[PDB]
Amino acid sequence: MLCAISGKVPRRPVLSPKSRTIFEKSLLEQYVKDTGNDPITNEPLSIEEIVEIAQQASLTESIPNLLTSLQNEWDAIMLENFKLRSTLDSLTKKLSTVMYERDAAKLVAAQLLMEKNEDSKDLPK
Amino acid sequence: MLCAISGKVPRRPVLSPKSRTIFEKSLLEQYVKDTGNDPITNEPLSIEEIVESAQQASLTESIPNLLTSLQNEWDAIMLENFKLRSTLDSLTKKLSTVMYERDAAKLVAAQLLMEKNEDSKDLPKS
Amino acid sequence: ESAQQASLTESIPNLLTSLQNEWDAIMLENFKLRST
Amino acid sequence: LTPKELLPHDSGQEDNERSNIKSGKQLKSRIRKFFASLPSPKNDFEILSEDEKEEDAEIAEYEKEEDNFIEPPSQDAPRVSLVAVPLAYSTLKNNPQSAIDNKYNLLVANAINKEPHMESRMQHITQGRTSMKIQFKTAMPPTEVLLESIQSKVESIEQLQRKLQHVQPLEQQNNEMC
Amino acid sequence: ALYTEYLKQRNNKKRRTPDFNDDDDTLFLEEYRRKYPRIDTSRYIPNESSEVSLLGIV
Fold this sequence. Notes:
This is part of a larger assembly, with three copies of chain A, one copy of chain D and one copy of chain E.
Chain A: E1 13-16, E2 21-24, H1 25-34, E3 51-52, H2 64-122
Antiparallel strand pairs in A: 1-2, 1-3
Chain D: H1 7-24, H2 28-32, H3 39-44, H4 52-64, H5 80-91, H6 94-117, H7 121-177
Chain E: H1 2-5, H2 24-50, H3 53-57
PDB class: splicing
Keywords: B* complex, snRNP
Entry title: Cryo-EM structure of the yeast B*-b1 complex at an average resolution of 3.86 angstrom
């Protein structure tokens, strides 16, 4: 029901043979023209590999309002795209702060075991 | 703009109705008088089959080309989301393993600060 | 069973200014054509 | 025993081995992939882990080099760090499911904090004012370099578009008279 | 009706209108301006790569 590139209900769906995934003909072709690969599994796939695989028409309501409806949806999609990008840069940033403290803690463990090794020599004497 | 047989600019274009392709009239007529065929697909084609109203037209410029333009705007923006969604499943998968090895190591740091202080507490009393 | 249209250098306008002029020119012409 | 151009290849290989140990044992996060110096934030975050947060803040200020750099007597680490990583891995289906459940809780917490925002508003318009300074000056440079070349051929386009509307108007009165 | 009245339906020019130090709905407006500038620079970058050549062939 959903193309796993844009999430639209596909109007001319194509399936990849290297990985089980029904894509859209337009979006998969733009990816293959960039790099000859499958977007999910990164396997070598070509345009001739694709096998070209429910349609229900929207009936919105009972025309100048439909202009401002389109204006609002492109306005919302631009913000629903922007908010998902700043979330990606900050979760990678907060992952970076965890990577420094992971490597700093395993250096603090080196001096703490030395204090335990110095203590084990003193307990034996 | 070009003739598919020769490669020149045709001065009298005729389009065939078996394989749609803009051929020059004097070139394709000799091709048909040779054998009754269409040079691209080798299907049968006669001279009367080759062909050179009221609604006035205007040049293709930036309604229809505007609607196909906004398809290109959004189908490219849809690929921009995939660059984000695939990078999010890599950083969060690495964050799950980093926070797990942080949660598994901090229990050892809590025990080493116990053991190295208990061994200092044991040795100094003796 | 290719055409090239050079998009303008000042291509907001495709949402606002270009799209209103297309549905103005569709509306005024056909009404003038019914008057014709 | 007669070495010729071998001690120079051995000194280069010994230098290539010493460079491999210094680059690998420099820092784990800095060598793999990708901050401002702030001693006031290290003083305000003291009141957390309360012992390891001050150890990781000084390790971040030392690796980055109101900033003073003090102790690069920290990272000969490469044999002590291998024994510490192997000892920590030994103390570490059930573990895979508990990590996937906590990752969905952190992803639900990341989607809740972004939903509440959409002080902090004054920084986003200033980033836009930097973007409106940078991109629109890049736009006006790309427009005027285009308009010196395209508006000459727009007039080659639009005046030849005007020839079509007169060739069409002469075609209809001639086909009417035919 | 629009041609008989001769009046056109108004488009949204709010993105030109936005101003600093304003409320949460206008914070959505300024971030909309950032996404439009990144798209406008991307659209200008394609035209520069194409060159006049693309205007020449049409």
